[PDB]
């Protein structure tokens, strides 16, 4: 068995902007799951944007992101959230959150060491 | 002293309602440390809150607040700020901002490793 992600929350936005992203767990315990989010801007690579231990308690960020993003948890509810402040065009992307058991301690930065992903939410920034 | 800190932001809420505090500084600012914040109420013991990073790419959480609060830094204001969600009459204490020079590792949870602090802002929480 796996873990189900479903991102949600994108669209278009304007410059400046405010947008909160969120993901839903299913199939399978998602305190069990320290979780990413990722972003692939359009011809680029997938990049790691930032991580949240299994209980909410450490959040680590990309230095593109740090300062404007905040990411959180509620296990209550199967959802991590990735709220995103400042946007600017740089920010469009398709982004993804992902899922992996904390037994290793790992680079979190490196979509390698992550073992189930979401379908991804596109957001558009103008 | 090298840094003074003064927060401010504290009042009297209902349970379930919000507030932001913030931390200002005089002397040198606050892009020169690592920043923690702790509460106490009294016949308590101090409490450890929120830990943020020198570079702000990390943050660290007590358990009796992950998920609710949220410590970040914007270091062109030179504020610290602490938004406390879904507060609890257990929240109710004198909360202070503290200052680290981030030269070493050390246990970023314990108050005895910081060097600097606030006078503190009463929250009360009904």
């Known amino acids: 068995s796996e873990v189900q992600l479903l991102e949600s929350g994108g669209g278009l936005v304007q410059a400046g902007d405010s947008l909160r992203l969120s993901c839903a767990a299913s199939?399978?315990?998602?305190?069990?799951?320290?979780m990413g989010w990722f972003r692939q801007a359009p011809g680029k690579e997938r990049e790691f944007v930032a991580a949240?231990?299994?209980?909410?308690?450490?959040?680590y960020y990309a230095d593109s992101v740090k300062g404007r993003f905040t990411i959180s948890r509620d296990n209550a509810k199967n959802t991590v959230y990735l709220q995103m402040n400042s946007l600017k065009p740089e920010d469009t992307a398709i982004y993804y959150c992902?899922?992996?058991?904390?037994?290793?301690?790992?680079?979190?930065?490196?979509?390698?060491?992550?073992?189930?992903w979401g379908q991804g939410t596109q957001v558009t920034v103008s | 002293s090298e840094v003074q800190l003064l927060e401010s932001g504290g009042g009297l809420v209902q349970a379930g309602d919000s507030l932001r505090l913030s931390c200002?500084?005089?002397?040198?600012?606050?892009?020169?440390?690592?920043?923690?914040?702790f509460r106490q109420a009294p016949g308590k013991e101090r409490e450890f809150?929120?830990?943020?990073?020198?570079?702000?790419?990390?943050?660290?959480?007590?358990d009796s607040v992950k998920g609710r609060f949220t410590i970040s830094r914007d270091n062109a204001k030179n504020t610290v700020y602490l938004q406390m969600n879904s507060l609890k009459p257990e929240d109710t204490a004198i909360?202070?901002?503290?200052?680290?020079?981030?030269?070493?590792?050390?246990?970023?949870?314990?108050?005895?490793?910081?060097?600097?602090?606030?006078?503190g802002t009463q929250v009360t929480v009904s």
């Open positions: 199939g399978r315990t998602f305190s069990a799951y320290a």
């Open positions: 992902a899922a992996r058991k904390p037994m290793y301690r790992v680079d979190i930065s490196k979509g390698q060491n992550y073992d189930y």
């Open positions: 949240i231990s299994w209980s909410g308690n450490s959040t």
